[PDB]
Amino acid sequence: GSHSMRYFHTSVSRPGRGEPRFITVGYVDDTLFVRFDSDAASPREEPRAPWIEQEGPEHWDRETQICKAKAQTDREDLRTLLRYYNQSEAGSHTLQNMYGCDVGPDGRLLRGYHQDAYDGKDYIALNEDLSSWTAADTAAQITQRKWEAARVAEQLRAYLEGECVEWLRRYLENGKETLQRADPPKTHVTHHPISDHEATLRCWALGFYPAEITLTWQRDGEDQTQDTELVETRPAGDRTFQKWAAVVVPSGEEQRYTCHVQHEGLPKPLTLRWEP
């Protein structure tokens, strides 16, 4: 199917507790493959997936060099943002960056991304055209002007359309056993009496990969969007994910309810019911 490569970066200042902590991770879909932590004993870009371990020492040195240079520019940017937002040097602040690419089943570029946030709010983002910017406010408009003068968008576009898609293709082939395998969900319905007059029906989905899934309950064939309790998809810790959806059903009416499950690993969407 379709795939993505993303790099995530977070810098968190801690005045009076040394320099900002920098943590960056790389993913292909829902698989972590590299990490770098400035608070580690010997900070380096470390492999986290067996299919990336094959990359040579010249590759690890390159990646480590980029991570160290990015931690440094983030430290400079955190100082800049204190000035742009007229803030004191006493508080802790957060800088986040994500960039990457999406490709279709044929490996062609679907779209590219490059976006930043300050203190959890949008700051500046490269538009889908990979040629213009969206600035959240008058402070980000200063960065927009600097980036337009420096033709940053053209540099980003070249990476997102070139190296980003080519290396994502390389990783997908090297990791085809895991990256190109969808694990369908293991599904079941549980019943939990709440009182004499109602019970909970919980529809489970376990052991699936990738994380993307749709779990819904219907009553007499009508979607129960408002009345369904849907937990956020959660990692099991073995690469797979979990999710459940629950509905409160009046005693004896369990057969009016049906659970619907959509997942990439399923050739056709499934329908489940509470069996006993």
Partner: peptide, 9 residues
């Protein structure tokens, strides 16, 4: 593979 480019706000 990371982008080697460096840019400042």
């Amino acid at each position: 593979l990371r982008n080697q480019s460096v840019f400042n706000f």
